[PDB]
RNA sequence: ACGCAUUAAGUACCCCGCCUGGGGAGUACGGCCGCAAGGCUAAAACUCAAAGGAAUUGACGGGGGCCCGCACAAGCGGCGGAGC
RNA sequence: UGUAAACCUCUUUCAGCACAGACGAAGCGCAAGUGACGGUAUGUGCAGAAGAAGGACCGGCCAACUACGUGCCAGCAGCCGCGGUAAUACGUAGGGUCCGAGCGUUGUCCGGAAUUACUGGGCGUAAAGAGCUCGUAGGUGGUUUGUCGCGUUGUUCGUGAAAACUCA
RNA sequence: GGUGAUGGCCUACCAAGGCGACGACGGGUAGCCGGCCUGAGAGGGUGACCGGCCACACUGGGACUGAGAUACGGCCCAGACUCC
């Protein structure tokens, strides 16, 4: 069954980005909305919007494509999955592509980029890698 | 000044009614050492002729590597045919640390300090193709920043920024020494 | 233990003149032996090996000593090749040869070994002593008047001394500022191959 | 395998094949021969290889090759066996040290002398 | 590699079974089940420097298709028997 | 071979022979002395190149090749494999390479081995999906509100003996 | 009851419980660690010197003295061995 909604988010995003679609429709959750907020802030997605469906809200994200047809997302991989969960200290924050990517970490202060978490000194569970 | 290396000379055979017809193959890598590399694979009836075909093919197929002064930008993992090669940036003064084919491609491209390891299919040609794929997977910070629409300050870390500064300073100092 | 065999032989094999001013290298630039004329297949191990051979056979160090020096330099924060060359140039024999009192490195080795020198007032007769910052090197009285030392010191118009070494008095006094950097070592050959060989 | 399957079963290493069993954790053993004889090698090769069937201090009977061109060893003499592989002889796993106990260093040997236990000339 | 390709062998998450060179061997001993035939669990000594998968170029087929040649078929004259 | 040598000059470390000769003891002691190491370390003199190099390897991995001697013999070998009268692979020579008071062999462990794959592997045909289901323990879990602070994270205190490791 | 001390530690009675696939009970092997070797790291191997604990003193039992006892150069008994 559906066991990992966040991995479902990531694989839907990855498949649509590989197929060059422009919009992506998901069932909606607050965690997914926050992840989309981080992705929008870091420039990976153009914009996201929540819309009401028959059984609830729905997340729609617009993908960002380069003027030469280049994709704004190179990879999308989850890290802390059910079963093996990954927690990171403030002094062991993961780096993606030598820091050229972004790692989204759930902390007591909320969802933060690894740069933000290293700056604030907090740590937590690493959710996914984006590059 | 084109630097050429020849990693594999392999004697290859086809059998006909009379017997075996023998021909030679050469895998040649051509690079200038300034960040421009290209791999060529040529085959002929003799070693010198196969070498000429390989060199011409490599010169025809060139390709640019995103270096940062001496080392590559970020770690990467290339995969071609059944060969797997991992590349990891190294600190200044380390030197090229890689196998035969990987070292040849890597030093023709102009990389000086880099960690490299081959994780399958020890065949030279497939390791070369895996290295080429890994190099193709590299990205420049300016292009990443343009791709995600952010200034370079929020994309690359401070260490890469200082390395960029020092590489630019060395380039300018050498240009000044050459011009005057 | 030192190496006593012929010196121009190793320059012949290694393709680089080491002492510098001999005629044998020029009249016989090819490697020794019956088959020194044979064409030789190229190999990266051959290159990296011969590089070390030039370094060690120019300075006089043995393999165990040189490997220990390499490990020390790799441990040092600087670039491994630079730390190598500056460590091997901190040796007393090399410093003496560089200051001009020795017409060659073998001269410096023997002249330090027989205790003709003294650093900061202590009789130091070991060639592998590593000169530090701010060291004053003087000679002893018995060696000051001896004929070969006198000849070399009085006729010393050969190769110029570098910056960090400085001879200052007619008594042949040596004084050092700093450990050299890669511009100031200015010995031949290359360091990257040296590093890669031991990285193998 | 899944992470739960790993926390359930785990990864087991490949079992190590004990090589040169007769030595019993010893570098060399002092044996004694039962026979001295020649043995024909495999198909591709052809020779007459000299061996000895040594009864060992480890209470094991082994066959050991005898290097060199000439050996003084006759039947049941004291020797010093050593580990070593020879393809030509399928069942031979040990070598006899030349120059120890009754074994004489081979004669007229001049090059790679230390392997064959021959003293330096004069 | 052949090929798979919304019925994936594609991108992903959860749980289970299994593999770690070829023989020896799914065999021996021990145990459980079975009326029996036997099944299930399952080694070691010894030995080899390979055993394999896919695809290529030839060769071959008491495989197919299309063609020829005193090859057969239709004829003439022989050799194999005798002396030299 | 080889600037190697022979020869001309030179310095003589270390050994040799002589003379001097400790620190270790702000110590012990109410006695005048108290150092086993030790007459050693260490100093100052004399003699003269004088008393001092060997071991593996040289088909490929793997730095380093030619001649003569046996021709499937004798032997070599870490793996492929070298020997069947013109062997760079055997033996001996020259020559060379690598180390050097060491140089090789054996034994054992780690590495290379992503070859038990947590980092970091797989199962159509190469080894590998139970013949197929049901279900116990276990593992795993859709959207959302509140609470706990067990997991998680931050900070502080105690502890983590010394030696070890790394930086000065 | 005992001990310095709690406690099936021992004893009398009463209840029938306690441990086990998160491997009881068995079998094999082994002193444990700070550390050492290797490795990029995780990991693998190991417990030489030096240092901290533990166990033992020909084998197997036992207690005494004592603040404190595996009491190596103590005692008692039974054994094997050496000697008068």
* Domain edges within chain A: 1-73, 74-131
Establish whether the CB of D10 is closer than 7 Å to any nucleic acid atom in strand E.
no
Asked whether the beta carbons of residue B148 and residue A72 sit closer than 8 angstroms, the reply is: yes
Stated length of chain B? 180
Chains C and A physically touch (3 or more Cβ atom pairs below 8 Å): no
CB B26 within 8 A of CB B42: yes
B34 to chain A, minimum CA–CA distance in Å? 23
- In a 3-state reduction of DSSP, which class is residue D22? helix
Could you say which residues from 85 to 104 on chain B have a Cβ atom under 8 Å away from some Cβ of chain C?
A: 92-97, 103
Query: How was this model experimentally determined?
Result: cryo-EM
Mutation target vs B (from A65, A66, A72, A98; most B CBs, 10 A cutoff): A98
Q: Which nucleotides of chain G does any protein CB come within 7 A of?
A: 22, 44-45
Taking only Cα atoms into account, the Rg of chain C, rounded to an integer number of angstroms, comes to 18
Give me the resolution in angstroms, 1 decimal: 4.7
Please give the Cα distance from B52 to B70 (Å, whole number): 30
CB D119 within 8 A of CB D108: no
CB B120 within 8 A of CB B52: no
CA atoms within 13 A on the CB side of B162: 3
Query: What is the number of other CB atoms lying within 10 angstroms of the CB of residue B54?
Result: 26
Please give the Cα distance from C158 to C154 (Å, whole number): 11
Give Cα B129 distance to the centre of its chain.
10
For residue B136, give both structure tokens: 């193709």
For residue B176, give both structure tokens: 């000044």
Give Cα C110 distance to the centre of its chain.
13
B117 in contact with C at a CB cutoff of 8 Å? no
Strands B96-97 and B114-118: parallel
- Phi, psi angle pair for A118, to nearest 5°: -70, -35
DSSP string for residues in C29-94:
-S--STTTTS-----HHHHHHHHHHHHHHHH---HHHHHHHHHHHHHSSS-HHHHHHHHHHSBHHH
Q: What distances in angstroms separate CA B7 from CA B86, B107, C40, C44, C81, one per listed residue?
A: 19, 12, 17, 12, 27
- Residues forming a β-bridge with B89: B114
Establish whether the CB of A83 is closer than 7 Å to any nucleic acid atom in strand E.
yes
- In a 3-state reduction of DSSP, which class is residue B109? coil
**Which residues of chain A neighbour B164 with C-beta distances below 8 Å?**
none
A74-131, what's its fold?
Dna Ligase; domain 1 (3.30.1490)
DSSP string for residues in D54-122:
EEPTTS-EEEEE--SS-----SS-EEEEEE---SSSTT--EEEPTTSTTPPPPTT--SSHHHHTPPP--
CB A116 within 8 A of CB A86: no
Q: What distances in angstroms separate CA D118 from CA C116, D37, D104, D107, D122, one per listed residue?
A: 45, 23, 8, 7, 12
Query: What is the number of other CB atoms lying within 10 angstroms of the CB of residue B120?
Result: 14
Strand G neighbours with CB under 7 A? D 8, 13
DSSP string for residues in chain A:
----HHHHHHHHHHHHHHTT-SEEEEE--HHHHHHHHHHHHTTSEEEEEEEE-SSSEEEEEEEPB-TTS-BS-S-EEE-S-SSS--EE-GGG---STTTTSEEEEEETTEEEEHHHHHHHT--EEEEEEE-
Please give the Cα distance from D99 to D36 (Å, whole number): 17
- Phi, psi angle pair for C38, to nearest 5°: -70, 140
For residue C124, give both structure tokens: 């130091």
- In a 3-state reduction of DSSP, which class is residue B40? strand
CA atoms within 13 A on the CB side of C56: 19
Torsion angle, alpha carbons of A56, A59, A60, A63, to 10: -170
Among chain D residues 6-35, those with CB within 7 Å of any atom of strand F? 6, 11-14, 16, 18-20, 23, 25-28
Interacting residues of B179 by C-beta distance below 8 A, sequence separation 6+ = none
**Which residues of chain A neighbour D2 with C-beta distances below 8 Å?**
83
Please give the Cα distance from B93 to B98 (Å, whole number): 15
Please give the Cα distance from C96 to C158 (Å, whole number): 14
CB C152 within 8 A of CB C108: no
A39 to chain B, minimum CA–CA distance in Å? 10
Domain A1-73 has CATH 3.30.980.10: no
- In a 3-state reduction of DSSP, which class is residue B17? coil
For tokens 């009864």, what's the residue? D55
């Amino acid at each position: 069954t559906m066991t990992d909604p966040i991995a479902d988010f990531l694989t839907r995003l990855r498949n649509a980005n590989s197929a060059y679609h422009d919009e992506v429709t998901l069932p909606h959750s607050k965690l997914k909305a926050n992840i989309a907020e981080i992705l929008k802030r870091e420039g990976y997605i153009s914009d996201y919007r929540t819309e009401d469906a028959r059984v609830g809200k729905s997340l729609v994200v617009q993908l960002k494509y380069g003027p030469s047809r280049e994709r704004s997302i190179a990879g999308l991989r989850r890290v802390s999955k059910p079963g093996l969960r990954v927690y990171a200290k403030s002094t062991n924050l993961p780096r993606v592509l030598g820091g050229l990517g972004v790692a989204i970490i759930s902390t007591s202060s909320g969802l933060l980029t690894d740069r933000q978490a290293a700056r604030q000194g907090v740590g937590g569970e690493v959710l996914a890698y984006v590059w | 000044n084109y630097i050429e290396r020849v990693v594999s000379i392999n004697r290859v055979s086809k059998v006909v009614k009379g017997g075996r017809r023998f021909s030679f193959t050469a895998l040649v890598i051509v690079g200038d050492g300034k960040g421009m590399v290209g791999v060529g694979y040529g085959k002929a009836k003799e070693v010198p002729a196969a070498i000429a075909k390989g060199v011409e093919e490599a010169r025809k197929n060139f390709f640019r590597v995103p270096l940062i002064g001496s080392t590559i930008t970020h770690p990467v993992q290339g995969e071609a045919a059944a060969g797997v090669v991992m590349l990891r940036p190294a600190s200044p003064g380390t030197g090229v640390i890689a196998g035969g084919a990987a070292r040849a491609v890597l030093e023709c491209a102009g990389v000086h300090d880099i960690l490299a390891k081959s994780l399958g299919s020890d065949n030279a040609i497939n390791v070369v193709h895996a290295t080429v794929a890994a190099l193709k997977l590299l990205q420049r910070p300016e292009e990443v920043a343009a791709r995600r629409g952010l200034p370079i300050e929020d994309v690359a870390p401070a260490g890469m920024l200082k390395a960029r500064r020092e590489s630019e300073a060395l380039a300018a100092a050498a240009a000044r020494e050459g011009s005057a | 233990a030192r190496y006593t065999g012929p010196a121009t032989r190793k320059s012949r094999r290694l393709g680089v003149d080491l002492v510098g001013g001999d005629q044998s290298f020029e009249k016989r630039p090819y490697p020794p032996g019956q088959h020194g004329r044979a064409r030789i297949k190229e190999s990266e191990y051959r290159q990296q090996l011969q590089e070390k051979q030039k370094a060690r056979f120019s300075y006089g160090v043995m393999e165990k000593q040189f490997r220990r020096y390499y490990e020390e330099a790799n441990r040092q924060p600087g670039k491994t090749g630079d730390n190598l060359l500056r460590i091997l140039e901190s040796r007393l024999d090399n410093v003496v040869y560089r200051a001009g009192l020795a017409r060659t490195r073998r001269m410096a080795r023997q002249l330090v070994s027989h205790g003709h020198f003294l650093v900061n007032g202590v009789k130091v007769d070991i060639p592998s002593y590593r000169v530090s910052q701010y060291d004053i090197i003087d000679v002893k009285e018995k060696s000051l008047n001896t004929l070969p030392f006198q000849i070399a010191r009085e006729t010393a118009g050969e190769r110029p001394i570098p910056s960090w070494l400085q001879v200052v008095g007619e008594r042949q006094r040596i004084l050092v500022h700093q450990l050299p950097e890669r511009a100031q070592i200015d010995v031949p050959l290359t360091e990257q191959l040296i590093v890669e060989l031991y990285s193998k | 395998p899944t992470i739960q399957q790993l926390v359930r079963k785990g990864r087991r290493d490949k079992i190590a094949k004990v090589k040169t069993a007769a030595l019993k954790g010893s570098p060399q053993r002092r044996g004694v021969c039962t026979r001295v004889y020649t043995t024909t090698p495999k198909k591709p090769n052809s020779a007459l290889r000299k061996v000895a069937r040594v009864k060992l201090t480890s209470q094991v009977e082994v066959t050991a090759y005898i290097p060199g061109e000439g050996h003084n060893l006759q039947e049941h003499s004291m020797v010093l066996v050593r580990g070593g592989r020879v393809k030509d002889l399928p069942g031979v796993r040990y070598k006899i040290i030349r120059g120890s106990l009754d074994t004489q260093g081979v004669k007229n040997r001049k090059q790679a002398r230390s392997r064959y236990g021959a003293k330096k000339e004069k």
